[PDB]
């Protein structure tokens, strides 16, 4: 109906009246769809809705560590299509870079494995790749670490004969992407513990911190527990095509929900903040 401009305007208004509190972002596949990477669960268009040809027990099994061990072919097949390299960051990714340049980015917790936040120039210290990435590989048995080249080389083979195996225990080796059944990197909870403490300090001191959740269905734990764990005194924002997770289950009075595409949201926010000059330096850098 009406433009989302008025809603995004309130976010800008919040930042302007609460300038001394950096912003935390929690993102998912939605912020990379415009880059050509499909999300996972949107009806019809989500990746999990287009895997019938693999004839898996069910879509999510392609990222399940137990299934992978039983038959690694399905994952190797899909990995060929989602391996990083030919994708470029979106306007939303550059919004993260803009916040970093203005030094108002506290952290970006991402569930994406495309590493586009890093490619957009966001510093390693401000990024938490909660679901891992293709940066390196590891044995699902003993945990031995391997360079990414071992796996990448195999992906380029056709047909594949033998899959990468650990020379220490003999189990299969795969990219350090967190599969269902595996624990997330220690950095995830360690950093959230730190940022959560920081959020309390800010509210227990005043200016209210802001957490913006974008492009995720909050269907996977433990990442989905983040919005729930945000202190009540901290303002939550959800920019997503659908109201999801804790924003739908336990709507809080101060919650601000905006149904908009991530890039358009970013453009509107930059406009309302009046940071076009610095944003321009980034898009052309």
């Amino acid at each position: 109906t009406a433009s989302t401009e008025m809603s995004v305007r309130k976010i800008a208004a919040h930042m302007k009246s609460n300038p001394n509190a950096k912003v935390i972002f929690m993102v998912g596949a939605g912020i990379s769809t415009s880059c050509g990477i499909p999300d996972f669960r949107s009806p019809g268009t989500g990746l999990y809705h287009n895997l019938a040809r693999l004839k898996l027990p069910y879509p999510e099994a392609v990222f399940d560590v137990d299934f992978f061990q039983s038959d690694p072919l399905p994952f190797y097949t899909l990995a060929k299509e989602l391996y990083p390299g030919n994708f470029r960051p979106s306007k939303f990714h550059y919004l993260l870079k803009l916040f970093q340049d203005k030094d108002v980015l506290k952290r970006v917790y991402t569930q994406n494995i495309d590493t586009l936040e890093r490619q957009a120039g966001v510093k390693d210290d401000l990024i938490i790749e909660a679901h891992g990435s293709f940066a390196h590989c590891h044995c699902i048995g003993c945990g031995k670490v391997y360079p990414p080249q071992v796996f990448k080389s195999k992906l380029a083979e056709h047909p594949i004969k033998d899959f990468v195996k650990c020379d220490v225990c003999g189990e299969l080796v795969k990219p350090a992407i967190v599969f269902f059944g595996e624990d997330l990197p220690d950095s995830f909870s360690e950093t959230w513990l730190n940022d959560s403490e920081w959020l309390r300090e800010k509210i227990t001191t005043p200016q209210q911190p802001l957490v913006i959740v974008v492009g995720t269905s909050l269907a996977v734990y433990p990442f989905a527990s983040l919005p729930e764990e945000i202190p009540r005194k901290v303002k939550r924002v959800l920019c997503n095509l659908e109201t999801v997770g804790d924003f739908k289950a336990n709507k809080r009075p101060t919650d601000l929900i905006v149904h908009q595409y991530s890039d358009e949201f970013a453009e509107q926010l930059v406009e309302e903040l009046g940071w076009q000059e610095d944003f321009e330096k980034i898009l052309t850098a």
């Binding site: 679901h131 967190v178 269902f180 595996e182 997330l184 909870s189 909050l218 996977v220 734990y221």
Partner: peptide, 10 residues
């Protein structure tokens, strides 16, 4: 929270 990566319970 922590624990193994999992699809939320329904």
């Amino acid at each position: 929270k922590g624990g193994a990566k999992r699809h939320r319970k329904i």
